Each structure stands twice: as C-alpha cells, then as structure tokens.
C-alpha cells in the first residue's frame, strides 16, 4: 500500500491558499508582501516550482507574511473568492485566477480600480481571524468562519456570492481549561477558534473547532449557519491545534488534525491569556468516514516532524512557530489526496496520501530500521526558547542487539541528565520512552519484542506499556492514566509482568514477545506465545486504539530495557 510521499515545501504555512486550477494544475499561494507569487504543479501534484502571479492578481493588502489568503472556487459561477487570514479585502475573479479581479465595496458593489488607494478606502473589510470560505446549500450561500481568541467563533455569511454580508446570530464556544492534576497551571485559552465547516447529506452544517480541552469541540446548524446548537466535545483528540474537514468526490468524509496530547501544564504556565510552550505539534493525522460520520477509520500519522529530537529545534533558521499542525487538502484522483501541512519553512510540507493506506489494517516496525520515520522518542530540555518552544533530546538511543548480528535496538531507561529538569517549573523529563502509531481498531492484536538490559536497575525500574487513542509524548509518565489499556513490566525483585494482581515472571537477558489482543473492554496478554493474563479497560475511547506507548518507570538512573519489533493488526469494522 502506498506510504505518504513528501513532494514539496509550500511557500506559506499550511491551511490557506492551496487551490486546484484545472485537472492537472494546482497552486499554493503565499503571504508575500512583495509582488504576489505561487508554487505551481502542472502534473497534478507531483512536481512543483515557484511562479510570479500575473499583473491582474491583487497583492496581499491584508494578511501576514507567513500565511496565504484563502482562495475558494464558487461552484455556480466557477469564479473564485479570496479572503485573508486577517485584515484586507474580499476579492472576486472574472476570468479565473489569471483574469480580472474586483474588490467588494461596503455598499455591495464591485471595484475594478483597487490599484487606486483612494478607492480602497470604501472596500468591505471582514473582521476577525478568518478561515476558509465554504459554499453550502447547492452553492447558494458562502460562509467564512471567524474568531476572537477569547470571544469565540461566528460566521460571515453572504447569499449573493460575496457582494453583501451579515453575521451569524451565534457560533461555537468552548470552556476554559481547569487546572487539576496532573496539571500545575492552566492551558492557553482559545474559545472554539479556527473552525472548519462541512455540510452533511441532510443539509446540517457541522463545525469542528480548536479548544483548550483534550479534544476539538463541535456544534451543528440547521439553517445553513445562522444559528448553532450547544457546543460539545468531538471525537477528535487534540488541543490548541487546527482541524480541517473535507469530502471526496464519492462522498467520503476526510478529517485532518494533530492527534496529540500535550504534556501537563507546569508550575510557570501563566494565566492562560497566551501560551507558555508547545509540546504537541510534531505530527499530523488523517481519518475517513464512508457513512456520514457514524463510523471512522484510519487515525494514521501522515508524518512526524523531522526535527523533533534535536537540541536546536526551537531556534534553527529563525524562531517563528514551527511544526506539523495546520493543513488543507485537494483530492488528486480516486485514491490520492494532496495535503499541505505544518508551519515554518523547515517544517511545512506538501504530502500525497493514499486512501488505501488510510484503510489498511496492519503495520509493522523495527526500531533500528524505522526510528527516524516512525518513532516518537523525544524528551524536552525544559527551558523556553524561541517563540513558545523547547529544545529536545532523543530520550532513547539505538544499541547493538546483545544476541549478535547486525540488528540495532532501542534502549529505554531512566536517564542521568540534569538538563532535563527544571525545578522552578517543577518538571523532570528524565524517563525515556517511545511511541508508535497503527491503524485504529476497537479490536486488534499488537505484539512487541523486548529484552531486559544486563546492568544495574533501580527498585522501580521497568516499562509502562499503554494502548492509547492519541500520541502521548515519549517522556509523559501520566500516559497510563489516560490509556485504554495499560500495564507495567517490573524488573525487581525479579522480572515480571503485573497483570491486575497476577505476576508473570520471565528471564532477564533474553528476548521475549508480548501480545495484547483487545476487544471491547478487555485485553488478553500473552508472553512468548502463552496466555499470561487479562486487563480491564482503564478508560473508554470514542474511537479505539491507534498507539502503543512505552515509558521507563525507574526513578533513578538504570539500564532499562531494549525494544526491537512491533506489529499491529486491527479488525474491518
Ligand atoms: C493593518 C493595516 O492597516 N493593513 C493595511 C495595509 C497596510 O497598511 C500596508 O500594507 C502598509 O503596511 O494597507 C492596505 C491598503 O489598502 O494599501 C490595506 C490594509 O488594510
Ligand atoms: C492572526 C493570528 O494570530 N493567527 C494565529 C493563530 C491565532 O493566534 C489563534 O487562532 C488564536 O487566536 O494561532 C496560530 C497558531 O497557534 O499556530 C497561528 C496563526 O498565525
Ligand atoms: Ca501551556
Ligand atoms: Cl513564509
Ligand atoms: Cl487583501
């Protein structure tokens, strides 16, 4: 099955400006303050180059340098509407992207002569931070989500193709984060911001919005956006990152988001007006639904941030926000989807994904071969750097397999590294760990191979093994508290699995395999092919399991354990 393929770096952060021109030509516009330009492919997304926009295309009067305006085709007129992420004007095309453009005036007319600064004074200016215009109701209405950081999302609405505008009665809101353990402070408050909107088959609109909770929140409209239901949590985990919904030609719904859990807030987190540090933006994910959202499949990692382990992460090539959050998509053919994702020139990417890979039911890995592409292992140096960033270290390293041969395997232990401690913030990220994604399942079988390192161990040394429904940081010792299933491998007094109350011993200094076969609210655990015990589900999930997470448990420096292979198979549902 075809794995995700990086094809280019877009000329702006992802989320706005990716637009199909015709069956073979696709563009990604930019936030340049100079003469406008775009990145273009003429082979349906495979190869790309920069090009200057023609003289009729208006500069970015509003916007910001790192974000393109959103550009959307009106399905009735086949012309385009352009709005910025913030500020500026509403432009409508006549003759397509490379035709004439006109700006919408405050009195519902079109201004052809927007190069005259005096004539720009009476142009319509839509307020707030805006996301993507979406045409709804057989193309007869266009709505543009907009927000205020603490005030919530509402919708700019036009019933005449962008000439005149009104505002929805209400929109989407979400509650402040409450500092309770394991947090030591409050998360940055965003009030249901950055909404993505999809029209459902029954005519309802579904809005999915970014929040300070553990998941995105959602509301629904029965009148094409004028009024919205009470907001509620969605099934899509994630915090303070962006959601994007779309629909393929055959009606399949696509959900793109960053499916992560941030580290718990520290003791210097601030009052929640602004962020202190980002610990959850190093991945992007996809799920799809063929039945109007009743059931979902996939929840697969599109990509991990290539810089995620590095001790210069926060400041390489300028301090601007970086990562793999934010996205926008264009279907390429029956099977393939082009996705722009991420932020910062060193991190943002255009990636082709295949729906047959989204719908796959198996995955396998070997740490020595697959660490750089598939494994999240980073710990953080807890000193804020750049803009709301931490520098990182790999929390685990590859070593020679003690059995001999050429295999390299991953050593997971409690680290002797004082640079991973901040006593004022009260965090200690010295427990190394590792986590790996697989296609989502409410029933499945995962197997992994591990070995105890021959060396000094602490009294609490071992490995906490968890199945989770989003990506928890490798160094997050609270993962078990949120997990679907979890158990410890304990090394003292002698090595054993603890499965409820049952201890199951095994030999140190030898490779062993453990299997977890989960279904509903319980999992069966096997060791070296023999049933060992059972586990009761610790937390329910709206979706199922899509990660296995391993974290060392020693509280003093130890030798730990080695991890070799993992494989997963899930049931179709
Ligand atoms: C925040 C703000 O006022 N942006 C304005 C910009 C900038 O002033 C200009 O790029 C110089 O920085 O001018 C403009 C224009 O119509 O020329 C419209 C836009 O509303
Ligand atoms: C105009 C502006 O600030 N846009 C920024 C938004 C808002 O800050 C956010 O939606 C809260 O309002 O956050 C972001 C981010 O978190 O990566 C980047 C984007 O550039
Ligand atoms: Ca925070
Ligand atoms: Cl840029
Ligand atoms: Cl503009």
Residue numbers in the entry: 25 to 595, 598 to 599
Authors' text:
To explain the strict specificity, we determined three structures of AmGH181: in ligand free form, bound with the transition-state inhibitor DANA (N-Acetyl-2,3-dehydro-2-deoxyneuraminic acid), and bound to both the T-antigen disaccharide (GNB) and DANA, which provides a mimic for a transition state-like substrate complex. At the catalytic site, R234 and R305 are shared with GH33, whereas glutamine (Q367) substitutes the third arginine in the GH33 conserved triad. A unique signature is the substitution of the tyrosine catalytic nucleophile in GH33 members to a glutamine (Q350) that is preceded by a histidine (H349) in AmGH181. Strikingly, Q350 and an adjacent glutamate (E218), both invariant in GH181, are potentially hydrogen bonded to a water molecule that overlays with the oxygen in the catalytic tyrosine of GH33 enzymes. This water is positioned for nucleophilic attack at the C2 of the sialyl (or the inhibitor) at subsite −1. Based on these data, we hypothesized that AmGH181 adopts an inverting mechanism that involves nucleophilic attack by the activated water molecule that overlays with the oxygen of the catalytic tyrosine in GH33 enzymes. The initial emerging signals were for β-Neu5Ac and α-Neu5Ac, in the reactions catalyzed by AmGH181 and AmGH33A, respectively. These data corroborated the proposed inverting mechanism of AmGH181, which is unprecedented in the evolutionary related CAZy clan E that includes GH33 retaining sialidases. The presence of two potential saccharide surface binding sites (SBSs) is intriguing. The first site is adjacent to the active site, where an inhibitor molecule was modelled, whereas a galactose unit was modelled at the second binding site located on the opposite side of the catalytic site.
